[PDB]
Amino acid sequence: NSQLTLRALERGDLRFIHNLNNNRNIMSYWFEEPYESFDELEELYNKHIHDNAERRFVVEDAQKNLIGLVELIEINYIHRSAEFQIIIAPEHQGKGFARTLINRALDYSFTILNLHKIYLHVAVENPKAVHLYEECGFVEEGHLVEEAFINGRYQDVKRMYILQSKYLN
Amino acid sequence: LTLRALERGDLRFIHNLNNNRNIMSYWFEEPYESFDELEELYNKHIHDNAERRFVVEDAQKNLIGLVELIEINYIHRSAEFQIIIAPEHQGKGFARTLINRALDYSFTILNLHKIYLHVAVENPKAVHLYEECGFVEEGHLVEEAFINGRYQDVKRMYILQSKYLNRSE
Amino acid sequence: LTLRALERGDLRFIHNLNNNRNIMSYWFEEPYESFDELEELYNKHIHDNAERRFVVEDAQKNLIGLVELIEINYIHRSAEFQIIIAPEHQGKGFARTLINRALDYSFTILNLHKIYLHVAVENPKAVHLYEECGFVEEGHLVEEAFINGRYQDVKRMYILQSKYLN
Amino acid sequence: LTLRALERGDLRFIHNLNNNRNIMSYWFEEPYESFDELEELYNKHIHDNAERRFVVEDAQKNLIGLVELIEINYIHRSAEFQIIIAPEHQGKGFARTLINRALDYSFTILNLHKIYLHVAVENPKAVHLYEECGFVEEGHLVEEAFINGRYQDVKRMYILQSKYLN
Amino acid sequence: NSQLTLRALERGDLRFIHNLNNNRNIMSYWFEEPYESFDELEELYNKHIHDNAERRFVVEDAQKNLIGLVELIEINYIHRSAEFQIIIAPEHQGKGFARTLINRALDYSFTILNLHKIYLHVAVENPKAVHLYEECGFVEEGHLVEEAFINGRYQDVKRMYILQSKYLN
Amino acid sequence: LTLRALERGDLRFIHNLNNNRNIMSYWFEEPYESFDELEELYNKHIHDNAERRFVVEDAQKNLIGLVELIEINYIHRSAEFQIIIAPEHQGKGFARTLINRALDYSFTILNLHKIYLHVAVENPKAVHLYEECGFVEEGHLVEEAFINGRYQDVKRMYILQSKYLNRSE
Amino acid sequence: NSQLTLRALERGDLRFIHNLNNNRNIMSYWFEEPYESFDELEELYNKHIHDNAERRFVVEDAQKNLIGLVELIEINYIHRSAEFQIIIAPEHQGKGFARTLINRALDYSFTILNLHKIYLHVAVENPKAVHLYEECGFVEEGHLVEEAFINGRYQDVKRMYILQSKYLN
Amino acid sequence: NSQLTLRALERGDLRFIHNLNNNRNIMSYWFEEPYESFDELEELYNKHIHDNAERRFVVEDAQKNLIGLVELIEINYIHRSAEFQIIIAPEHQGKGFARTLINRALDYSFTILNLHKIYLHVAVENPKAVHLYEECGFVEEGHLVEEAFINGRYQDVKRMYILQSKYLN
Amino acid sequence: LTLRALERGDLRFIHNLNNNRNIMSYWFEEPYESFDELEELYNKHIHDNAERRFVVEDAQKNLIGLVELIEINYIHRSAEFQIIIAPEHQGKGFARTLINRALDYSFTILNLHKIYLHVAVENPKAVHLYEECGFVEEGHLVEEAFINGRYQDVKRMYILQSKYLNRSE
Amino acid sequence: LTLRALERGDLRFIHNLNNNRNIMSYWFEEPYESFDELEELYNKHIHDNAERRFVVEDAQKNLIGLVELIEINYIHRSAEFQIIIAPEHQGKGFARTLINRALDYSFTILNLHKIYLHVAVENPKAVHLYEECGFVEEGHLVEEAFINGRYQDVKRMYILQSKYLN
Amino acid sequence: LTLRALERGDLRFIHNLNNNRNIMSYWFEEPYESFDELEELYNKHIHDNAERRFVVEDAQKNLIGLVELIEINYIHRSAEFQIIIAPEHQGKGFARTLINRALDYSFTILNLHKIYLHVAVENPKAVHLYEECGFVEEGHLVEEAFINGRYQDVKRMYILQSKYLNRSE
Amino acid sequence: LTLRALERGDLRFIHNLNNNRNIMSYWFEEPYESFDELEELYNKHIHDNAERRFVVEDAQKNLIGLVELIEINYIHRSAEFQIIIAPEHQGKGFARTLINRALDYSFTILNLHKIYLHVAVENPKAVHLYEECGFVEEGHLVEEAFINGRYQDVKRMYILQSKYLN
């Protein structure tokens, strides 16, 4: 876990992004723009190469095996907020990397960019994921009713947050 | 009461409404403060369908207020609702009528499934007004906004298409 | 009654016709609501030949209604027809004379083979008028349009160049 | 069989599928014939969401066919469906499993209400297969398509999100 | 007739072009581009302001009454050819202006631009117009079968020509 | 025999065909003489539907000739036909087969009503070849082209959709 | 003083900006771009209409007499900093407006944009201006040696600051 | 001589153009644009790829040895004129190719493009070149005094011409 | 008499001058016939220094004529001269004065070495007028222009800088 | 007398000053003659800092003359100076007060080290005035300018920031 | 030791240097984190002279570090200095040599008058290093930067052109 | 020795000549330092005729030096001259033969009247060589160049087309 490294996303890593969106049954977005094919993603990356609303970091190990991804979106510098998301490759989902990657993301958000609040969304029907984030410091602030259409049915999603104060202290 | 799509001529009425608010005003997720800044971003997003705004005026062309629909996603069929009545006609009882006619357009024309909005916790008069129109609280965002030199909480209330169109049946 | 090619000055009348229809208005398969959005869309598609619109006006030049041809396909030689008469002169019985001249332009100048249209099921009076003008049903599209918070069926009627020109 | 988002490298397979169809091919309602014209049209509409195409391939990744969604309207939540299987694997009975997955993507992710398609009248075998997949006729378009020097009728069949998702 | 004058077509004259195409029941073209409304014509004129494939001259009298129009299209300088057309306002069609305007057009084509051949097209069912051109020097060179779709039916058109040699001698 | 839409790679084969002609070659009514001039105008009119060209090749990719459809008007439903067989396979009897397959595409796919072509009067072998395929003379254009230092006449022959599809019925 | 109002800068106010830069003997900048004439300023305003690095507010009284100007430049949202400047018309310089305009600017910076630190620069040879700012809450943090070339000689400038904490408490 | 062939100028031939302008001590032009380096020529060729005012043909033999160049400039299709020029490589200047290349150029000008007059310019101090052209059919029409600045001194140049009539008869 | 650089407002006066000529008028080697065609090409070549034109007017703003310098080459230091006096003031004896003042600008400001012009052989009055001003015939171009349906000859006369500035010394 | 930054409205006065000079006028090292050519060149170089021009006007705002700085180099900190007074107020002795204020702007705000200028040899009165203002000759350029059909010599005079600011 | 202007090929070496810093890196006042983001902003500001950077390498092309000059104002003749030596050659004593050669370029080539820099107060080793090279403290910016989750102070040191070039005289 | 028009491939040699000069290098009056900045500036001014540069190379094609003409004015017919020889072949005495051919191109093809140049005062050996080639001083520019932290004087020498062509 300590060997894991985070690196700024490069064009070469777009293939890894495409592979991770396979068999997830949810439309993928790139700066709030839908995409499906590798070519559509590559164009959207070239377009938003300069945008500051989102940042992404690839997660690798010592031997540079692509572990997962860390995304920050809806980044606002006036209110100092950002939506956090994390995607771990299926082959590494059950190895406990998630917790460390969550602290790595909070570290980058609250120590460098100096953001005030980090919020995230979790499906209500994955309580193990909710409890994980709670053990990491997050806490619920909303229960969005029928917010996401997942697998052919509207579903609720928990919005949980954590402030810069608690993480730094 | 009559609702009309916003024309470029009504932009000044929007700027005037933003004078008393004392909050950072946005136009398609882009900050603005001068009337000229607004007019240019209006010419830029005249075709963008991510947001739609309607100005309401009396029978004889007395502009009363404004209703806005932002963060419009036609895949999730959602949108954020907001309304601002001029201080002149603020307490004449026009609010609820504009709200219902806004939700009517969202649920009968655009065929949207969910409509949410945000209100500061320090103004319970608005919280009860929307709750009287069918909105229900789905979140209590902690320290979401920075108002007058302090971080404050925000209530997120919602209303669904099914309820608005089938409740009296 | 006289039909005239749609000009930029008539876009105001278009915006008024869409004032009380309770359905999203399109311009070359692109939505719009405000007069400014329409004016820009017109200047964008001013040369696109996939759609053609004529304004019908009285002898005094008082605008009466509108006739539109959309989805114009010159390979299969077909196009969709739509007609909107102002509420002021809706029941003056002018509708038929407008439908005929429209079909005349379609089958005499543009040289199109088929002309279809869509009419709501819950408005049988329009179905009869169209039928009496020469149209015949060819489809009962199920839940094709979302009107007033509920999907509704729509009848698709057609008319060939042969029946109008013998 | 596995469906994959259409890439630029697959445009060659598209041009081969259109090789022996005897009808003009379109890309976002724009005609084309050569592989160069198609490649430019794709780069032009690479971000347009009005159409979506998936390539179906074997376990060995041998391309088998194509499934397309066109006329995608997110307001009325509808789209037209089309499927083309290569002649090599036309009669292997895979057609049904392709139609279902397509409807699955339409009604599970994009959240569309209706899906319609058009099939020639003189090919009843396709009408039966579509019917057995869940489709039901809603229109008999008269002389809607010009095939082999003669206008021919076309049946329009539909299927709602309700029947597929209960 | 001798008082008639020909002038290069200006933007202001586009209204006269539009008025002449009323009740002619044939699609109007501007540099092989279809148009119907005044605005569509004005745009096409601005576009082809510089093109050399076609020239047009307005026909006026002493008191500047708009008499008609003289068009040269499909102008090719390698083969030295051009298709001639003439449109006279309905109020002046039966006053004998046509003959002089035909000589004026031939004069400009064979004396200035120095073209070799001028051809034109006439409906087979207007023999009075054919005989007119023959009396002016033209002669048939083709009987195009079902070349034009006029008033709801394909119709034949006579193609008649005349060379620079005969006009100059 | 197999007809294929012309790709950019076949442009050299077109230039080679224009070597023996000794006539000004055009591309969408634009003159060209160098292979590079052709390639640039090809990139310019790749989307223009006013003309369509097909290259025919043997069973094992031996490019034989070319068939062209120019002046395509989808309102009048007309088009000018032309065919050029390489000097290698010139007298192998492939012409009539390419002609019929060209008219078949024009009358069954594009749904055109009339197809005309042009041939020099000084090559009666071509005049009889087309006449054997259904074409009929509709015009004898006098001094229409300038060939080898002299003005020559040109025959315009035509064939209709009705005849091509209904004659053997 | 209490009647003074601050308004977002509009294009019409550019004339007031030009008048204030008269007889100040220092090159004027607009988003770090030099200018002298009214036309050069107007162009630079149109260019940076959308930039977020600087904001400016016109200062008016009850009767809308142009009092002065309030400028925020070098605005950085990551470090939350901004350089403050104030220009009062010569006819209003000795009426005590400065103090209130300083609090108005700090109010907008620390209560809306939520910035952490506001710094400014003062000529060392204007101690009355330095003492003013100190009485307003500022304090020196640097004595830049020969930083500005004023009136034909390099001169030192005091850099004084104040944090959001003290102003809000 | 009979084996010589003329080919339309291609981009690959621009190196031959550059080599021929070596040690000629006169500024080279490309569509009335000066150039010296290979890169400047290549850009000007890409620019005027489509211009019709000039045409150029490379002269090769049976074994494709680059013999010379044939240039037509100032081509006007209204007056039907063109300035002719010919450049033979130094290794082939004294082999009698000039005469045949002159007839080849006249053949292309008077038989294909159908031009009326071909004029050329010759230095007065090269009478052998003047007599050559006279033997080819040209004749003097002007003695331009101090028209060209050659090798550090203004010099006269003979303008000689020939019409399409004499060449064709 | 006073010469003034041509402004856009004088373009109509140029078009009027081209009415009586009955010859193809050009603007930077580009044909034009309508006033709008002229105005657009004027906006296109406002910066082109290949040609320069001056309008002359009386003491009280009575526009008399025009003098033009075209084909200006600053390497060879040459230019073609032409002058057109309105038919109103045609025979008032102003020509020679405008000519000398044109050559004065060419030889004293632009520092040109040679000035040539062209005149039809069928107007000896102009030939003698220029010859009286210092011009000398250097060429008799045979069938250079096509005037009123016939090819005619043109005289090219010239005058040198040395003569114009040193002859009376 | 008051100097003001050159505006677009003053371009007319510029064109009048060049009316009777008998020499080609330049704008940012680009020739021009007509007011339209100048107006476009100004809009092109409105942000170029290589040149700066001030209009001097009376108390009544009657334009008197012009002062220009060209070839402005901020690395070597130098610039060429030129002054043109209208013929109406040429001999009113205002020239000196204009030269000084110009040098003041060059050496007090822009922080330039050297300022040079060029004056014809055949006009010694201007050479004296410049000399009396602080300038000193540094070059006798031989046949550098072509004036009235003959190359003429030009004197280049200079002045440093040190002599003006002690 | 040899200093060289930075080429596009050296951009990767810059990104590597920014890995160990753990601070937001900028390029012409624009944030970046990915190598591709850097490369695009490099192509954008290749002409911008507001900043200049030099890469230093050993005698045999061993890239050691980088020296940067930003906020270059040629009117005030100032600039901010910064240097980053790779961790490999960090403590080899190369720093002072690169500093002096940077100030030499700033004071002898660009002819700048003042050079300032910034250093964190929590690294006195750098403060003394610059002080040993001639830099003197002119400011102690309080809570200027946000480093590792806390606001920290920054020292601004400066050195003048006169001192660097005249002190040993 | 042979002079050749400067190509894009020679820009590398240009960047090497500027490697050890200790002064800012310009390209069409625009500063640059890196090879990438120079390559873009060349493509920008590849057609500008205000400057012309020739590369001089040996018989073996080993690059020896460079000759440049800048500030080319075709109205007054003048231009500034500069020559740079690589340190490898600086003292081989080739300098004179290069200066002559340059002046030959200026006065034989471009038809220019005057050619001036600038040489530092503290390098009298170059002043003598230029003088022996035909140049004559016409100006002693005072503190015109900032070299090695100190303003230095520069001599401006000239040569007319008449003296070179009699």
mmCIF file of N, CA and C in Angstrom, chain J residues 69-107:
data_model
loop_
_atom_site.group_PDB
_atom_site.id
_atom_site.type_symbol
_atom_site.label_atom_id
_atom_site.label_comp_id
_atom_site.label_asym_id
_atom_site.label_seq_id
_atom_site.Cartn_x
_atom_site.Cartn_y
_atom_site.Cartn_z
ATOM 1 N N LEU J 69 7.593 59.160 -31.327
ATOM 2 C CA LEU J 69 8.728 58.323 -30.956
ATOM 3 C C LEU J 69 8.607 57.015 -31.724
ATOM 4 N N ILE J 70 9.640 56.678 -32.496
ATOM 5 C CA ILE J 70 9.646 55.474 -33.314
ATOM 6 C C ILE J 70 10.928 54.700 -33.037
ATOM 7 N N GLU J 71 11.007 53.502 -33.619
ATOM 8 C CA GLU J 71 12.148 52.611 -33.417
ATOM 9 C C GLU J 71 12.451 52.450 -31.929
ATOM 10 N N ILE J 72 11.393 52.369 -31.125
ATOM 11 C CA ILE J 72 11.548 52.258 -29.680
ATOM 12 C C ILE J 72 12.089 50.873 -29.347
ATOM 13 N N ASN J 73 13.280 50.832 -28.754
ATOM 14 C CA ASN J 73 13.930 49.589 -28.352
ATOM 15 C C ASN J 73 14.115 49.631 -26.841
ATOM 16 N N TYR J 74 13.433 48.732 -26.133
ATOM 17 C CA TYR J 74 13.491 48.714 -24.677
ATOM 18 C C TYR J 74 14.690 47.947 -24.135
ATOM 19 N N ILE J 75 15.415 47.214 -24.978
ATOM 20 C CA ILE J 75 16.626 46.534 -24.524
ATOM 21 C C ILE J 75 17.785 47.518 -24.435
ATOM 22 N N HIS J 76 18.145 48.132 -25.564
ATOM 23 C CA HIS J 76 19.145 49.191 -25.563
ATOM 24 C C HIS J 76 18.597 50.515 -25.050
ATOM 25 N N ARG J 77 17.280 50.628 -24.878
ATOM 26 C CA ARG J 77 16.658 51.817 -24.300
ATOM 27 C C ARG J 77 16.962 53.053 -25.148
ATOM 28 N N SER J 78 16.466 53.019 -26.384
ATOM 29 C CA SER J 78 16.662 54.100 -27.336
ATOM 30 C C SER J 78 15.397 54.262 -28.168
ATOM 31 N N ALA J 79 15.311 55.390 -28.867
ATOM 32 C CA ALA J 79 14.163 55.678 -29.716
ATOM 33 C C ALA J 79 14.478 56.895 -30.570
ATOM 34 N N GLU J 80 13.893 56.928 -31.764
ATOM 35 C CA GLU J 80 14.045 58.058 -32.669
ATOM 36 C C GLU J 80 12.930 59.066 -32.427
ATOM 37 N N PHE J 81 13.270 60.347 -32.534
ATOM 38 C CA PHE J 81 12.348 61.435 -32.245
ATOM 39 C C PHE J 81 12.041 62.219 -33.513
ATOM 40 N N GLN J 82 10.788 62.651 -33.638
ATOM 41 C CA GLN J 82 10.354 63.472 -34.758
ATOM 42 C C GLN J 82 9.262 64.412 -34.270
ATOM 43 N N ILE J 83 9.252 65.626 -34.811
ATOM 44 C CA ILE J 83 8.288 66.651 -34.428
ATOM 45 C C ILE J 83 7.833 67.376 -35.686
ATOM 46 N N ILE J 84 6.524 67.587 -35.806
ATOM 47 C CA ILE J 84 5.929 68.287 -36.939
ATOM 48 C C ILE J 84 4.927 69.291 -36.387
ATOM 49 N N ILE J 85 5.123 70.565 -36.713
ATOM 50 C CA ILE J 85 4.221 71.637 -36.313
ATOM 51 C C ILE J 85 3.462 72.107 -37.546
ATOM 52 N N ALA J 86 2.171 72.377 -37.374
ATOM 53 C CA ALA J 86 1.358 72.827 -38.490
ATOM 54 C C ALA J 86 1.908 74.143 -39.039
ATOM 55 N N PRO J 87 1.762 74.389 -40.345
ATOM 56 C CA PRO J 87 2.258 75.661 -40.898
ATOM 57 C C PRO J 87 1.622 76.875 -40.248
ATOM 58 N N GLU J 88 0.388 76.743 -39.759
ATOM 59 C CA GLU J 88 -0.287 77.870 -39.127
ATOM 60 C C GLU J 88 0.509 78.402 -37.941
ATOM 61 N N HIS J 89 1.075 77.509 -37.132
ATOM 62 C CA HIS J 89 1.798 77.878 -35.921
ATOM 63 C C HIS J 89 3.241 77.387 -35.966
ATOM 64 N N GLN J 90 3.882 77.500 -37.130
ATOM 65 C CA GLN J 90 5.253 77.020 -37.260
ATOM 66 C C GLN J 90 6.246 77.983 -36.619
ATOM 67 N N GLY J 91 6.072 79.283 -36.839
ATOM 68 C CA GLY J 91 7.043 80.260 -36.386
ATOM 69 C C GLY J 91 6.684 80.949 -35.086
ATOM 70 N N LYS J 92 5.754 80.376 -34.326
ATOM 71 C CA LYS J 92 5.359 80.944 -33.043
ATOM 72 C C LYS J 92 6.328 80.595 -31.917
ATOM 73 N N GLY J 93 7.460 79.967 -32.229
ATOM 74 C CA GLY J 93 8.461 79.671 -31.225
ATOM 75 C C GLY J 93 8.086 78.601 -30.228
ATOM 76 N N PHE J 94 7.008 77.856 -30.472
ATOM 77 C CA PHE J 94 6.597 76.797 -29.561
ATOM 78 C C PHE J 94 7.448 75.540 -29.686
ATOM 79 N N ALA J 95 8.259 75.427 -30.740
ATOM 80 C CA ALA J 95 8.959 74.177 -31.021
ATOM 81 C C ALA J 95 9.759 73.692 -29.817
ATOM 82 N N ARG J 96 10.520 74.589 -29.187
ATOM 83 C CA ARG J 96 11.397 74.171 -28.097
ATOM 84 C C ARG J 96 10.602 73.538 -26.960
ATOM 85 N N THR J 97 9.548 74.216 -26.501
ATOM 86 C CA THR J 97 8.748 73.678 -25.406
ATOM 87 C C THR J 97 8.169 72.309 -25.736
ATOM 88 N N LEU J 98 7.982 71.998 -27.021
ATOM 89 C CA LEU J 98 7.493 70.675 -27.397
ATOM 90 C C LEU J 98 8.601 69.633 -27.316
ATOM 91 N N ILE J 99 9.797 69.974 -27.799
ATOM 92 C CA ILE J 99 10.912 69.034 -27.759
ATOM 93 C C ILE J 99 11.226 68.641 -26.321
ATOM 94 N N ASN J 100 11.168 69.604 -25.399
ATOM 95 C CA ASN J 100 11.523 69.319 -24.012
ATOM 96 C C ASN J 100 10.534 68.348 -23.378
ATOM 97 N N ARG J 101 9.234 68.622 -23.511
ATOM 98 C CA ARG J 101 8.235 67.736 -22.922
ATOM 99 C C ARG J 101 8.350 66.328 -23.494
ATOM 100 N N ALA J 102 8.630 66.217 -24.794
ATOM 101 C CA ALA J 102 8.834 64.903 -25.395
ATOM 102 C C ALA J 102 9.988 64.173 -24.719
ATOM 103 N N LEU J 103 11.155 64.819 -24.646
ATOM 104 C CA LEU J 103 12.286 64.217 -23.950
ATOM 105 C C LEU J 103 11.949 63.924 -22.495
ATOM 106 N N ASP J 104 11.096 64.746 -21.882
ATOM 107 C CA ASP J 104 10.683 64.488 -20.507
ATOM 108 C C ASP J 104 9.943 63.161 -20.407
ATOM 109 N N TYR J 105 8.992 62.926 -21.314
ATOM 110 C CA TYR J 105 8.259 61.664 -21.307
ATOM 111 C C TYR J 105 9.189 60.486 -21.568
ATOM 112 N N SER J 106 10.195 60.681 -22.424
ATOM 113 C CA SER J 106 11.096 59.586 -22.765
ATOM 114 C C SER J 106 11.985 59.210 -21.586
ATOM 115 N N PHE J 107 12.468 60.204 -20.841
ATOM 116 C CA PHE J 107 13.461 59.980 -19.801
ATOM 117 C C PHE J 107 12.875 59.925 -18.396
#
